[PDB]
């Protein structure tokens with residue numbers, strides 16, 4: 001059970017923190033959205049929220065990651081929501097399949113329930 | 114006709130403001146992108162823009178929300194662009210199907226036309 | 227070879243900078259994700275990263291742009307990752323098919339490799 005602080009950036013100017021699946025998973029188009037396990041857990045740094053986005057090299061290989069919002073105070077496991085677009089896609093364990101982007105959480109007076 | 118200020122957050126640390134459809138809508142894969150009415154209108158707080166994203170529980174049920182950019186000064190109705198991925202999806206009136214994220218609008222010197 | 231500074235905003239309050247394809251491209255659903263050339267190159271303003279998102283009018287016409295992360299220091303050509311959802315889509319040269327959003331790049335102590 002690992003916190004977001006254990007994630008790494010590919011390069012200094014990389015916007016995203018790499019996310020890997022902890023399991024070998026095969027996806028087919030007819031399966032629809034699948035939630036892939038990462039072994040990485042919220043919560044996020046104060047005043048930030050997360051966006052899970054695809055890596056372009058993985059998108060172009062036919063695996064769509066659905067953009068996912070990670071709430072600031074989520075303490076569960078970050079999962080990647082993914083779908084094989086046209087073809088059979090195989091994710092090997094430890095392959096980098098998504099990225100976590102951190103963004104400022106703007107305060108508003110919207111009511112909270 | 115309701116402003117974004119009438120939206121609510123599920124919880125204090127929730128990144129997104131919940132968006133519901135004002136209509137019962139059935140979607141099938143062959144229908145392609147459909148714009149669902151929300152009865153909620155721009156514009157956005159100063160120096161912010163909006164991103165419409167899916168709720169993960171709804172994505173995993175086979176309804177894809179296409180990420181949508183809400184411009185700061187848009188004064189029209191915020192619609193959710195949505196597609197049934199694989200199966201027939203039914204949206205009941207008032208079910209929460211998307212979320213609005215507010216983000217800082219960065220100024221640039223890019224020319225404006 | 228044109229920098230992001232040559233991009234234009236539709237309007238002052240437009241969140242996104244317009245991206246056009248430099249080629250006439252026809253897309254069919256069975257083709258899967260295609261990377262469309264823009265002739266526009268990184269890098270991004272300091273402390274920012276980019277998100278490529280669809281234009282709603284183009285999404286509703288059946289062309290899905292996969293959200294793409296542009297790293298701050300990417301110096302290559304910005305490409306639009308796109309897919310025809312259900313039908314045959316034709317992109318004419320110079321038609322605006324996506325938008326670039328600029329966002330703050332938050333610093334973290336995540337290790338960098």
Ligand SMILES: O=c1ccn([C@H]2C[C@H](O)[C@@H](COP(=O)(O)O)O2)c(=O)[nH]1
Nearest residue numbers: 068069070071074078079081168169
């Ligand atoms: O791709 C995603 C999207 C969401 N979540 C988790 C974190 C979110 O805080 C929580 C609730 O999801 P949303 O309602 O924010 O979409 O689910 C993920 O693990 N992966």
Ligand SMILES: O=c1ccn([C@H]2C[C@H](O)[C@@H](COP(=O)(O)O)O2)c(=O)[nH]1
Nearest residue numbers: 181182183184187191192194281282
């Ligand atoms: O999912 C969306 C995307 C856009 N719009 C509205 C607000 C945007 O300001 C306007 C123009 O769309 P874009 O060009 O920003 O994509 O359409 C929506 O209501 N829902």
Ligand SMILES: O=c1ccn([C@H]2C[C@H](O)[C@@H](COP(=O)(O)O)O2)c(=O)[nH]1
Nearest residue numbers: 055056294295296297300304305307
């Ligand atoms: O839609 C996209 C996504 C990415 N890239 C380029 C810029 C990114 O910095 C680089 C690496 O992609 P990612 O790993 O950030 O997804 O590819 C694009 O040109 N278009």
